[PDB]
Scaffold this motif. Structure first.
Motif, PDB file in Angstrom:
ATOM      1  N   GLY A  64      43.513  -9.311 -24.731  1.00 56.20           N
ATOM      2  CA  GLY A  64      42.492  -9.989 -25.499  1.00 56.20           C
ATOM      3  C   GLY A  64      41.355 -10.398 -24.571  1.00 56.20           C
ATOM      4  N   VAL A  65      40.160 -10.486 -25.136  1.00 53.83           N
ATOM      5  CA  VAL A  65      38.959 -10.943 -24.399  1.00 53.83           C
ATOM      6  C   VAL A  65      38.235 -12.010 -25.213  1.00 53.83           C
ATOM      7  CG1 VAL A  65      36.733 -10.315 -23.428  1.00 53.83           C
ATOM      8  CG2 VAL A  65      38.703  -8.752 -23.201  1.00 53.83           C
ATOM      9  N   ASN A  66      38.067 -13.181 -24.614  1.00 54.79           N
ATOM     10  CA  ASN A  66      37.435 -14.324 -25.249  1.00 54.79           C
ATOM     11  C   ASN A  66      35.977 -14.372 -24.797  1.00 54.79           C
ATOM     12  OD1 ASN A  66      36.576 -17.169 -25.562  1.00 54.79           O
ATOM     13  ND2 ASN A  66      38.768 -17.464 -26.201  1.00 54.79           N
ATOM     14  N   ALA A 122      27.232 -11.092 -29.849  1.00 51.46           N
ATOM     15  CA  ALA A 122      27.025  -9.653 -30.103  1.00 51.46           C
ATOM     16  C   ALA A 122      27.006  -8.852 -28.801  1.00 51.46           C
ATOM     17  CB  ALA A 122      25.750  -9.405 -30.913  1.00 51.46           C
ATOM     18  N   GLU A 123      26.352  -9.392 -27.756  1.00 47.86           N
ATOM     19  CA  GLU A 123      26.315  -8.725 -26.453  1.00 47.86           C
ATOM     20  C   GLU A 123      27.755  -8.586 -25.916  1.00 47.86           C
ATOM     21  OE1 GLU A 123      23.477 -10.905 -23.991  1.00 47.86           O
ATOM     22  OE2 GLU A 123      21.774 -10.420 -25.243  1.00 47.86           O
ATOM     23  N   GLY A 124      28.557  -9.644 -26.043  1.00 44.43           N
ATOM     24  CA  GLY A 124      29.956  -9.561 -25.598  1.00 44.43           C
ATOM     25  C   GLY A 124      30.761  -8.498 -26.358  1.00 44.43           C
ATOM     26  N   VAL A 125      30.530  -8.421 -27.665  1.00 44.32           N
ATOM     27  CA  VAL A 125      31.199  -7.387 -28.493  1.00 44.32           C
ATOM     28  C   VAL A 125      30.847  -5.997 -27.987  1.00 44.32           C
ATOM     29  CG1 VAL A 125      31.510  -6.360 -30.755  1.00 44.32           C
ATOM     30  CG2 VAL A 125      31.367  -8.862 -30.542  1.00 44.32           C
ATOM     31  N   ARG A 126      29.547  -5.785 -27.770  1.00 46.97           N
ATOM     32  CA  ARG A 126      29.028  -4.505 -27.269  1.00 46.97           C
ATOM     33  C   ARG A 126      29.653  -4.079 -25.946  1.00 46.97           C
ATOM     34  NH1 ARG A 126      22.477  -4.295 -28.703  1.00 46.97           N
ATOM     35  NH2 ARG A 126      22.760  -5.172 -30.810  1.00 46.97           N
ATOM     36  N   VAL A 127      29.742  -5.029 -25.025  1.00 45.59           N
ATOM     37  CA  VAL A 127      30.105  -4.746 -23.642  1.00 45.59           C
ATOM     38  C   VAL A 127      31.611  -4.734 -23.439  1.00 45.59           C
ATOM     39  CG1 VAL A 127      29.848  -5.453 -21.262  1.00 45.59           C
ATOM     40  CG2 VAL A 127      27.885  -5.507 -22.781  1.00 45.59           C
ATOM     41  N   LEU A 128      32.301  -5.749 -23.941  1.00 48.13           N
ATOM     42  CA  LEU A 128      33.757  -5.851 -23.712  1.00 48.13           C
ATOM     43  C   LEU A 128      34.647  -5.459 -24.865  1.00 48.13           C
ATOM     44  CD1 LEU A 128      33.895  -9.059 -21.431  1.00 48.13           C
ATOM     45  CD2 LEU A 128      33.738  -6.688 -20.781  1.00 48.13           C
ATOM     46  N   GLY A 129      34.101  -5.384 -26.079  1.00 53.64           N
ATOM     47  CA  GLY A 129      34.843  -4.890 -27.214  1.00 53.64           C
ATOM     48  C   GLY A 129      35.549  -3.573 -26.970  1.00 53.64           C
ATOM     49  N   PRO A 130      34.874  -2.601 -26.295  1.00 57.17           N
ATOM     50  CA  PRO A 130      35.546  -1.303 -26.036  1.00 57.17           C
ATOM     51  C   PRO A 130      36.697  -1.348 -25.073  1.00 57.17           C
ATOM     52  CG  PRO A 130      33.194  -1.050 -25.981  1.00 57.17           C
ATOM     53  CD  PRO A 130      33.440  -2.536 -25.998  1.00 57.17           C
ATOM     54  N   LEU A 131      36.861  -2.469 -24.378  1.00 54.90           N
ATOM     55  CA  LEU A 131      37.905  -2.643 -23.390  1.00 54.90           C
ATOM     56  C   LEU A 131      39.023  -3.575 -23.834  1.00 54.90           C
ATOM     57  CD1 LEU A 131      35.212  -2.891 -20.662  1.00 54.90           C
ATOM     58  CD2 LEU A 131      37.101  -1.296 -20.514  1.00 54.90           C
ATOM     59  N   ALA A 132      38.931  -4.091 -25.058  1.00 54.29           N
ATOM     60  CA  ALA A 132      39.844  -5.110 -25.538  1.00 54.29           C
ATOM     61  C   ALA A 132      40.653  -4.627 -26.724  1.00 54.29           C
ATOM     62  CB  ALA A 132      39.020  -6.317 -25.980  1.00 54.29           C
ATOM     63  N   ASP A 133      41.874  -5.116 -26.854  1.00 51.11           N
ATOM     64  CA  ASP A 133      42.621  -4.994 -28.110  1.00 51.11           C
ATOM     65  C   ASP A 133      42.180  -5.960 -29.173  1.00 51.11           C
ATOM     66  OD1 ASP A 133      44.245  -2.765 -27.322  1.00 51.11           O
ATOM     67  OD2 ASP A 133      45.199  -4.157 -25.898  1.00 51.11           O
ATOM     68  N   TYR A 134      41.805  -7.170 -28.750  1.00 47.89           N
ATOM     69  CA  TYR A 134      41.207  -8.162 -29.641  1.00 47.89           C
ATOM     70  C   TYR A 134      40.160  -8.955 -28.896  1.00 47.89           C
ATOM     71  CZ  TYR A 134      44.195 -12.040 -27.864  1.00 47.89           C
ATOM     72  OH  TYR A 134      44.841 -12.993 -27.107  1.00 47.89           O
ATOM     73  N   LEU A 135      39.141  -9.357 -29.637  1.00 48.07           N
ATOM     74  CA  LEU A 135      38.090 -10.232 -29.154  1.00 48.07           C
ATOM     75  C   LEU A 135      38.251 -11.586 -29.808  1.00 48.07           C
ATOM     76  CD1 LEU A 135      34.999  -7.933 -29.495  1.00 48.07           C
ATOM     77  CD2 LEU A 135      36.117  -8.641 -27.343  1.00 48.07           C
ATOM     78  N   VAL A 136      37.827 -12.629 -29.102  1.00 51.94           N
ATOM     79  CA  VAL A 136      37.853 -13.999 -29.646  1.00 51.94           C
ATOM     80  C   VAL A 136      36.460 -14.630 -29.564  1.00 51.94           C
ATOM     81  CG1 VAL A 136      39.006 -16.231 -29.605  1.00 51.94           C
ATOM     82  CG2 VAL A 136      40.141 -14.209 -28.695  1.00 51.94           C
TER      83      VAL A 136
END
Ligand SMILES: Cc1cc2nc3c(=O)[nH]c(=O)nc-3n(C[C@H](O)[C@H](O)[C@H](O)COP(=O)(O)O)c2cc1C
Ligand SMILES: O=C(Nc1c(F)c(F)c(-c2ccccc2)c(F)c1F)c1c(O)nn2ccccc12
Ligand SMILES: O=C(O)c1cc(=O)[nH]c(=O)[nH]1
Ligand SMILES: [Cl-]
Ligand SMILES: [Cl-]
Length: 357
Positions: A149-151, A166-180
């Protein structure tokens, strides 16, 4: 009751905490963990600990909460400790230093911590590159039931929270199973706006790189706030809730000399406030929204109480700071024993069980 659990709890951890302020200890802990300098994790996860939720398999339900590995430096070592899942962050878009020191305080008499780190973060770019360095290893770990997970946080000076997320979703979303995303008290229309933007950005990621999105709440919400959050989460199709962050309350009874320091209180004084927030959110969402329960877990009983209240998974942090790495195996062992004793086939059968009484 292993040799390691007792030695860490009675000798090693009190000695380190007597020698090192909590921020220094935190940094040393991250360093040791990143290097794999850990006691052996003797506990083997049984089948009864497996949970399928959020689109993934979790080989056990005990995770490390956000804020321990803020910058993604120690993910592999945290799996080696025995955690079923790891949550890194909070990560802010730009690097930032956080609040002035001192900013972390132990309340040993309360089994509690107060922190006001202020989202000290290496920033998205640094964390993106760290995760990319081990992206394939993480894919195999996730497939083996060890998700990541990535918070996501926001910068102190940002004028639009939604754009930071939104920037966090763009950048780390592809590397995470879940975002917080952490949400605080509203207002409802603003939450809907923010979460709509986050979901739209997530939905723009390629399917194999598209994470679940969870909202992490404080325990400091009014009943109206909780109602509103539950409504928005259901309306928008948010994938889960993390319940809870630290509290800005100071329950009567705190004994630690540092109880009146500003910041979020974690550990035992938060435990039942968190459990009751889980119970409320489970009911407000009709049990249809997975909850990760967190706040004051240091035993199997603590974990099972959260699970029965409605949590599918749990996290801990403060207990690690007092008991050290063996606490992970302790909580797992105790939880399995309590599941058996209460007649559950596994974790899954216990989720929300108190609501069916
Ligand atoms: C020192 C410290 C730093 C934290 N930093 C973060 C953070 O960056 N993001 C976040 O969502 N939660 C953060 N938290 C909250 C934890 O993830 C967790 O929700 C809370 O501490 C309750 O769990 P515990 O009682 O097991 O520690 C932090 C907690 C502590 C103690
Ligand atoms: O991390 C902290 N302690 C702390 C520590 F000092 C440690 F050596 C470890 C540790 C890590 C790997 C192998 C052996 C011991 C560990 F797992 C810890 F958790 C710590 C603390 O002692 N107070 N505190 C308060 C807020 C955040 C972290 C911490
Ligand atoms: O960085 C922090 O101060 C912090 C973030 C968070 O979400 N929770 C917390 O207790 N501290
Ligand atoms: Cl495409
Ligand atoms: Cl006081």
């Amino acid at each position: 009751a292993t040799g390691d659990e007792r030695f860490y709890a009675e000798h090693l951890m009190p000695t380190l905490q007597g020698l090192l302020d909590p921020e220094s200890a935190h940094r040393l802990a991250v360093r040791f963990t990143s290097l794999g300098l850990l006691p052996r994790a003797r506990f083997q996860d049984s089948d009864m600990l497996e949970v399928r939720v959020l689109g993934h398999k979790f080989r056990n339900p005990v995770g490390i909460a956000a804020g321990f590995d803020k910058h993604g430096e120690a993910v592999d070592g945290l799996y080696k400790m025995g955690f079923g899942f790891v949550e890194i962050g909070s990560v802010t878009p730009k690097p930032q230093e956080g609040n002035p020191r001192p900013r972390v305080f132990r309340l040993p008499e309360d089994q509690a911590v107060i922190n006001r780190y202020g989202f000290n973060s290496h920033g998205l770019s640094v964390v993106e590159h760290r995760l990319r360095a081990r992206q394939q290893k993480q894919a195999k770990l996730t497939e083996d039931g060890l998700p990541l997970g990535v918070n996501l946080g926001k910068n102190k000076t940002s004028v639009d929270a939604a754009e930071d997320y939104a920037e966090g979703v763009r950048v780390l979303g592809p590397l995470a199973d879940y975002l917080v995303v952490n949400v605080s008290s509203p207002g409802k229309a603003e939450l809907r706006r923010l979460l709509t933007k986050v979901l739209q950005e997530r939905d723009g990621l390629r399917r194999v790189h598209r994470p679940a999105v969870l909202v992490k709440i404080a325990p400091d919400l009014t009943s109206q706030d909780k109602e509103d959050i539950a409504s928005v989460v259901k309306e928008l199709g948010i994938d889960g809730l993390i319940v809870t962050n630290t509290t800005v309350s100071r329950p009567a009874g705190l004994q630690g000399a540092l109880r009146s320091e500003t910041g979020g209180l974690s550990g035992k004084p938060l435990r039942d406030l968190s459990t009751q927030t889980i119970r409320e959110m489970y009911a407000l969402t009709q049990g249809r929204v997975p909850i990760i329960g967190v706040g004051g877990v240091s035993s199997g009983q603590d974990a099972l109480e959260k699970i029965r209240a409605g949590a599918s998974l749990v996290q801990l942090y403060t207990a690690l700071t007092f008991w050290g790495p063996p606490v992970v195996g302790k909580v797992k062992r105790e939880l399995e024993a309590l599941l058996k004793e209460q007649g559950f086939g596994g974790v899954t059968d216990a989720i929300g069980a108190d609501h069916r009484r």
